[PDB]
């Protein structure tokens, strides 16, 4: 396999939408590299338009659960949950190629049924919204209010602007 040879170099590719399926695969690969050597860095390449939040949280919690530093590299694009994960990379090791686009926005979802049920779901969506903003603020150095306002709607950025914002540390010139 091609991806297997790359994994041998501790290179993990996250491409496409994030869902439980994609998440179990990434998480599975991260746990693997850890067992092979808990000290050697890992390279998580990200090209994703976003996806399910809890699925993304599983990846993020795993990245910090393991010992190796997980570097993140954005190629193509890192949007919404993708940008989130990219910013969750080990400090100093969050990268992006020169022509990548980074986007951040608030959660999107749906709710159906009785008023009571919709209310519960709405509150949980907001909890996830506050949860991600807090983390986005933490990873970028920006304030909660600043993140909350900037992500109210799609917030597109170039690699250089994402860097100047605090989402990544360097752009491979």
């Amino acid at each position: 396999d091609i991806y297997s040879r790359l994994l041998k170099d501790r290179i993990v590719l996250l491409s496409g939408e994030i869902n439980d399926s994609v998440a179990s695969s990434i998480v599975a690969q991260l746990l693997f590299l850890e067992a092979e050597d808990p000290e050697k860095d890992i390279g998580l390449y990200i090209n994703s338009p976003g996806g399910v939040i809890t699925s993304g949280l599983s990846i993020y919690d795993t990245m910090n659960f393991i010992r190796p530093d997980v570097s993140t590299i954005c190629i193509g694009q890192a949007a919404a949950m993708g940008a989130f994960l990219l910013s969750c990379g080990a400090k100093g090791k969050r990268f992006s190629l020169p022509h990548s686009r980074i986007m951040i926005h608030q959660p999107l979802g749906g709710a159906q049924g009785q008023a009571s049920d919709i209310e519960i779901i709405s509150n949980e969506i907001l909890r996830l919204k506050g949860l991600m903003n807090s983390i986005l603020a933490q990873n970028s150095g920006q304030s909660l209010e600043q993140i909350a306002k900037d992500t109210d709607r799609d917030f597109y950025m170039s690699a250089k602007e994402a860097k100047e914002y605090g989402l990544i540390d360097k752009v491979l010139q």
């Binding site: 996806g51 399910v52 939040i53 993304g56 919404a80 608030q106 959660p107 999107l108």
Partner: peptide, 4 residues
């Protein structure tokens, strides 16, 4: 499910 909730998504971003």
């Amino acid at each position: 499910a909730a998504a971003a």
